[PDB]
Amino acid sequence: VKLFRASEPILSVLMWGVNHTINELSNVPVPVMLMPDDFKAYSKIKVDNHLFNKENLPSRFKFKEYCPMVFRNLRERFGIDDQDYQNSVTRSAPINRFLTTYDRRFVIKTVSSEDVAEMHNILKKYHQFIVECHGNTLLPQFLGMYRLTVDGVETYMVVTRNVFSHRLTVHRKYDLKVAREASDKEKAKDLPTFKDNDFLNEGQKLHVKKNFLEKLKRDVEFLAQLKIMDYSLLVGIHDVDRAEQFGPGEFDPSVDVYAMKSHESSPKEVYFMAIIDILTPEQYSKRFNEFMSNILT
Amino acid sequence: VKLFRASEPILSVLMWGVNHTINELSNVPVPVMLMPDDFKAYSKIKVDNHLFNKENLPSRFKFKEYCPMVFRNLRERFGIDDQDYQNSVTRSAPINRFLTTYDRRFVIKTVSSEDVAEMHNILKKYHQFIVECHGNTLLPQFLGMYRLTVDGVETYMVVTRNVFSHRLTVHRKYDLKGSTVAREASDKEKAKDLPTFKDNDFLNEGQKLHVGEESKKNFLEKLKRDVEFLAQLKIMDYSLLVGIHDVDRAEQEEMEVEERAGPGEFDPSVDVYAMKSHESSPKKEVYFMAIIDILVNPEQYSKRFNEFMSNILT
Numbered sequence: 113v114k115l116f117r118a119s120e121p122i123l124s125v126l127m128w129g130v131n132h133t134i135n136e137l138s139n140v141p142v143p144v145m146l147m148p149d150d151f152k153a154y155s156k157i158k159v160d161n162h163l164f165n166k167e168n169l170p171s172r173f174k175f176k177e178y179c180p181m182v183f184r185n186l187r188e189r190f191g192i193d194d195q196d197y198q199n200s201v202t203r204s205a206p207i208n209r210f211l212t213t214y215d216r217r218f219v220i221k222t223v224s225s226e227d228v229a230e231m232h233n234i235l236k237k238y239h240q241f242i243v244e245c246h247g248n249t250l251l252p253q254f255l256g257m258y259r260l261t262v263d264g265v266e267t268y269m270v271v272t273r274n275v276f277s278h279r280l281t282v283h284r285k286y287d288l289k290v291a292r293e294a295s296d297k298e299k300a301k302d303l304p305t306f307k308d309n310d311f312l313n314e315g316q317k318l319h320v321k322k323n324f325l326e327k328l329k330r331d332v333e334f335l336a337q338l339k340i341m342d343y344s345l346l347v348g349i350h351d352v353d354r355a356e357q358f359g360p361g362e363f364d365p366s367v368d369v370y371a372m373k374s375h376e377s378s379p380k381e382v383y384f385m386a387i388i389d390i391l392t393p394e395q396y397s398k399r400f401n402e403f404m405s406n407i408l409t
Numbered sequence: 410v411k412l413f414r415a416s417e418p419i420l421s422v423l424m425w426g427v428n429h430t431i432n433e434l435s436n437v438p439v440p441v442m443l444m445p446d447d448f449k450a451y452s453k454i455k456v457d458n459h460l461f462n463k464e465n466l467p468s469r470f471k472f473k474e475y476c477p478m479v480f481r482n483l484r485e486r487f488g489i490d491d492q493d494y495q496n497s498v499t500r501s502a503p504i505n506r507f508l509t510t511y512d513r514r515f516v517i518k519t520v521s522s523e524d525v526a527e528m529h530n531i532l533k534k535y536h537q538f539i540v541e542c543h544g545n546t547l548l549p550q551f552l553g554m555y556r557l558t559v560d561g562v563e564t565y566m567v568v569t570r571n572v573f574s575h576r577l578t579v580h581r582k583y584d585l586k587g588s589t590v591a592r593e594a595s596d597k598e599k600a601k602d603l604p605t606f607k608d609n610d611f612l613n614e615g616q617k618l619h620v621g622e623e624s625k626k627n628f629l630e631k632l633k634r635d636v637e638f639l640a641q642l643k644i645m646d647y648s649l650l651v652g653i654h655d656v657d658r659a660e661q662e663e664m665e666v667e668e669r670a671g672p673g674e675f676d677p678s679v680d681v682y683a684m685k686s687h688e689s690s691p692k693k694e695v696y697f698m699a700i701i702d703i704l705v706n707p708e709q710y711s712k713r714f715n716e717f718m719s720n721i722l723t
């Protein structure tokens with residue numbers, strides 16, 4: 113029994129919504145191919161519940177799913193089963209807009225109307241690229257896109273596969289791309305988002321490189337051709353020994369897709385690296401490219 | 410994998426709605442008791458799809474379920490499981506508004522806004538009656554009440570358990586009121602396959618139903634409390650629907666079926682209104698007898714009704 117028990121009405125509606133659209137989809141046949149209209153398509157449902165089942169859900173709310181055929185195909189191509197996705201969102205309220213499913217597999221980010229517009233703008237080529245690279249990429253894996261109406265307020269969400277391990281604690285993270293670096297207050301946060309300079313003058317490398325670089329180049333090239341910028345490479349680091357204070361450094365490469373073991377010859381950790389934030393050319397790409405090509409040793 | 414394929418979009422939407430509402434209710438816990446708000450409550454869903462899932466469902470439709478907590482409970486008290494209900498409605502399209510589920514277990518009747526209003530008016534009392542009578546009644550067993558919206562047009566529907574068997578074939582039928590006013594069937598109706606014979610038609614044939622005392626007493630006691638309950642509310646024009654199954658004829662028809670390619674028994678948990686003919690009647694038969702259409706004065710209407718049905722059978 114999924115009650116859609118959550119800290120805020122909006123989370124409840126998200127849970128309800130994912131549950132609903134995925135059951136509905138299970139009634140929709142898997143087609144031989146995506147079609148042009150699938151990229152211009154949506155489902156919309158409006159709920160108006162008088163004196164009923166408003167123990168957790170708002171009595172009145174809307175839920176809209178952009179291009180459900182496309183995002184179900186992306187799901188399949190990312191090796192993700194519809195039932196597991198549904199369970200991750202619904203079996204328990206997602207946790208604290210930036211959200212994570214209770215099991216930490218999927219990230220739910222609140223986004224703008226123009227982010228949604230832009231996603232629609234890249235979606236065909238992005239899909240074709242996921243096809244052509246066989247879901248082997250560092251780009252965000254987009255799993256679903258929704259608009260929620262709650263108390264008259266529209267909210268937009270995008271679901272991605274988590275960059276980080278859904279199990280291995282991340283001990284230090286960097287957001288790589290002038291010059292930028294972490295603030296005098298952000299550096300006082302539990303897990304700080306460090307930047308390029310904090311990384312450079314700290315003299316850190318990542319002993320691992322072939323796959324990562326081939327992949328990364330192909331990706332940032334694709335992002336260039338779409339005239340997109342501002343995207344960052346998210347890097348996460350889990351210190352095995354630090355955890356050691358069901359084995360340490362143990363993970364499922366088919367789940368934690370971006371995870372990477374430290375090379376046998378190293379001062380032992382787990383790295384997670386993936387490109388985030390591309391919903392916004394050449395120079396940015398080659399600059400980004402070279403900066404990241406110099407972290408792997 | 411339910412496609413909701415149907416010859417009319419109204420039916421697809423019916424299937425989708427029962428499916429959707431039953432699954433939703435599966436998330437809703439079963440209460441210790443029903444509350445007053447449960448009798449004034451409704452669920453409403455409005456769907457506007459664009460360029461998506463249009464092979465069977467229309468892109469735009471509305472579905473409303475009346476007092477769903479109540480009807481769920483009613484289903485429980487009539488020994489009908491929600492998954493079975495759902496399956497009966499959605500596994501395959503209902504068939505010919507007067508519909509029957511593909512498996513013949515449930516009747517879907519198209520009604521009026523007036524009808525829906527009267528359901529609400531009588532619902533708390535009908536519920537309590539079903540409670541204190543333990544589900545043992547000739548009255549319609551109400552299982553669900555819905556409003557569909559297709560093409561800006563609104564359609565109300567009431568679901569009941571079939572009075573007739575979901576398996577056994579009905580070879581003759583009567584709609585009986587007991588009116589002093591003459592009630593026969595038209596040449597039109599009499600030319601139909603299974604005509605709806607009426608009062609004077611029943612009188613004319615010297616027709617009688619022999620069920621034996623122990624079944625007669627049960628029947629008549631049900632009937633007496635039923636029409637007394639109906640008389641209490643301002644309820645009139647309701648009928649006794651009478652189906653007659655010829656066991657022998659059926660064995661014959663089956664035989665013609667197996668040739669061109671058990672006997673007179675039934676599950677009373679399922680064919681709730683079925684009665685075997687008396688161990689020593691002429692031809693052996695099964696009858697189905699229920700009160701239908703409950704949505705001069707009511708008291709006398711029920712005296713006039715009860716005397717006629719009381720004489721309908723020995």
Ligand SMILES: Nc1nc2c(ncn2[C@@H]2O[C@H](COP(=O)(O)OP(=O)(O)NP(=O)(O)O)[C@@H](O)[C@H]2O)c(=O)[nH]1
Binds near residue numbers: 219273274276388389
């Ligand atoms: N655990 C986890 N955290 C993430 C993931 N993606 C982003 N984050 C974190 O959430 C924040 C959101 O970053 P971003 O997508 O750039 O959103 P933004 O608001 O446009 N940028 P900013 O970080 O400056 O606010 C980042 O600081 C990052 O640390 C993820 O997949 N998993």
Ligand SMILES: Nc1nc2c(ncn2[C@@H]2O[C@H](COP(=O)(O)OP(=O)(O)NP(=O)(O)O)[C@@H](O)[C@H]2O)c(=O)[nH]1
Binds near residue numbers: 523
């Ligand atoms: N006694 C009673 N009648 C009710 C109740 N709910 C609905 N009705 C009656 O049932 C009839 C059908 O109502 P319905 O078609 O749902 O629509 P509506 O409530 O009129 N408004 P709308 O058509 O805008 O949805 C109406 O005549 C209404 O008065 C209730 O709780 N109690």
Ligand SMILES: Nc1nc2c(ncn2[C@@H]2O[C@H](COP(=O)(O)OP(=O)(O)NP(=O)(O)O)[C@@H](O)[C@H]2O)c(=O)[nH]1
Binds near residue numbers: 507516582605
């Ligand atoms: N198989 C079956 N037929 C039923 C059932 N209830 C009613 N009918 C039939 O369906 C028709 C309509 O019955 P009724 O409820 O009186 O509807 P109505 O609209 O009030 N009357 P009518 O349609 O005859 O003018 C009749 O042919 C009746 O015999 C039922 O449970 N099962």
